[PDB]
C-alpha cells in the first residue's frame, strides 16, 4: 500500500522517498550517486540505509527538513519544500 | 585514526553541520 508514498514530511522527512527532484524554488537537485557539480561527502554507499537514491529530495542527516544538493554551481545545497503532515 | 568519527550519524551531523557552516559562510559571502 506504499504506492501511495504521500508527497509530505512524516518524521524528519527522512522516510519520504518520493522522487521529487526539485528543490525548494525548483532547482534541479544533484544525484546523490554524482560528485558533479558538487563534490560531496554524501555516498549512497556510506549512507545506504538512508534510501539515499538519483536526484530526489531525501533526508538523511536529519536536517530540519528535506534537502538536496544543488545542480547550480552557485549553490552548493537546497532545501525541499515539502508539505508537513502531523506525524 | 579513520576520516570518520566511526559511525554513520557522526559523519552525518557532520556533513550536516559542513553544510549549516557553508550556508552562513554563503550568507556572509554575499552581499549583493
Known amino acids: 500500500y506504499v504506492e501511495f508514498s504521500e508527497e509530505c514530511m512524516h518524521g524528519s522527512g527522512e522516510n519520504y522517498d518520493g522522487k521529487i527532484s526539485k528543490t525548494m524554488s525548483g532547482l534541479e537537485c544533484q544525484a546523490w550517486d554524482s560528485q558533479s557539480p558538487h563534490a560531496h561527502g554524501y555516498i549512497p554507499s556510506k549512507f545506504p540505509n538512508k534510501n539515499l537514491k538519483k536526484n530526489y529530495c531525501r533526508n538523511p542527516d536529519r536536517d530540519l527538513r528535506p534537502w538536496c544538493f544543488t545542480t547550480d554551481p552557485n549553490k552548493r545545497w537546497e532545501y525541499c519544500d515539502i508539505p508537513r503532515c502531523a506525524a | ?32
Open chain 2, 1 to 32: 585514526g579513520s576520516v570518520e568519527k566511526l559511525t554513520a550519524d557522526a559523519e552525518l551531523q557532520r556533513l550536516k553541520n559542513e553544510r549549516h557552516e557553508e550556508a552562513e559562510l554563503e550568507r556572509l559571502k554575499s552581499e549583493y
